């Protein structure tokens, strides 16, 4: 069971590795990456990896190696750099009762794994029954360093019915270790005296 440490993009986090060695020539070390310089502060029984302004490059598998009297040990930890900005867009921007579909798109997001990034279409708090997700469509968008993603989910709308809901809400949920983040974007539903006279 490989541990998983989540850190938001641009955030900071300290990973610490200790070694119980009562001998001489005891060393413990985080395997430094060619993308850092001075990120590791080691001693003889403890080593602290430091991540400031976390980028996607610092993301990956980090290994902590220890030696105790000519005896080497290693323990792995998965470092996860996630980005979950408040950038949701909806197509169409507004809904009309009778419409067959609605699309939500989360921008500049990662990870995109379904087990992490889930979409739900809410009405007045909870999920709108009668909906039907039509499978996510993950797309890599171009933001130079580094590769982020644009996931889009589409629903098959049910008959909204009467009374007409004030609006539907697209919710993007991201599940992380011991943490759930969510974002919502409003999809107003136009109804009734829409265009009227005098």
């Amino acid at each position, epitope marked *: 069971p490989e541990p998983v440490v989540a850190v938001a993009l641009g955030a900071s986090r300290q990973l610490t590795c200790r070694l119980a060695c009562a001998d001489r020539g005891a*060393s413990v*070390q985080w*395997r*430094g*990456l*060619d*993308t*850092s*310089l*001075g*990120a*590791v*502060q*080691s*001693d*003889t029984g403890r080593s*602290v990896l430091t991540v400031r302004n976390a*980028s996607l*490059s610092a993301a990956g598998t980090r290994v902590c190696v220890g030696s105790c009297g000519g005896r080497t040990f290693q323990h792995t930890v998965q470092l996860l750099v996630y980005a979950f900005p408040n950038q949701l867009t909806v197509s169409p921007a507004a809904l009309v009762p009778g419409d067959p579909e609605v699309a939500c798109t989360a921008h500049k997001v990662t990870p995109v794994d379904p087990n992490a990034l889930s979409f739900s279409l809410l009405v007045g708090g909870q999920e709108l029954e009668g909906a039907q997700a039509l499978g996510p469509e993950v797309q890599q968008e171009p933001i130079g*360093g580094d590769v982020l993603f644009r996931v889009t989910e589409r629903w098959r709308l049910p008959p909204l019915g009467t009374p007409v809901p004030p609006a539907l809400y697209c919710q993007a949920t991201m599940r992380l270790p011991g943490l759930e983040l969510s974002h919502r974007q409003a999809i107003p539903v136009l109804g009734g005296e829409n265009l009227y006279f005098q």
Partner: antibody
Amino acid sequence: DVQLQESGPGLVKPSQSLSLTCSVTGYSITSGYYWNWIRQFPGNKLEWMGYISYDGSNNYNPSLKNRVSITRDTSKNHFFLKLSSVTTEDTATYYCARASDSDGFAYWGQGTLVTVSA
Amino acid sequence: DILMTQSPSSMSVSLGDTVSFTCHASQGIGRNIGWLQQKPGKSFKGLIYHGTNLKDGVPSRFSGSGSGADYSLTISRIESEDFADYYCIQYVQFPYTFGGGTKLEIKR
């Protein structure tokens, strides 16, 4: 096999600018690592001037902070050092070096001597 | 800046012996130290990184030790191609600072 070789004018007049070039071959200065500039004064005192990282970010020595500028050229795989308002006390041998938490200042250039004098 | 004070300034030793010179940092630097070798006239070559790591291609005769603010480079079985000046560098905070050097002379 990574190679670094400095190059540039050996003589520079006071007040003028000192410019050097590091031609890196065998590794891409955008793939990884931090690319540094070090100088060694007559008498063998060393001083770190600054670096430019793989991502293009900079970091300089406060003692030189106003005058130093380490830019790069990803096309030719070169990176450069510019120093302004040069006095005679900048006479030194300038080295370029690639460092990181995997190698730790493993690769250096041959070093180029720059004299400041009228 | 972090002041790196290494000693001795220079030392004479016989072929085959074992020598060490220390480096004392003005504050703790968590083994973020590099040992550099400079042959007279030539350039540098990073022998050791992060206090105790031997850069690949460097003889095992070289070894670094220490923690906190006190580190030591130790050369054993001194050969003919070990006669140089040795510097220590710290890179745990900006600016990166060097030691004064340690000229290693050979007895004959």
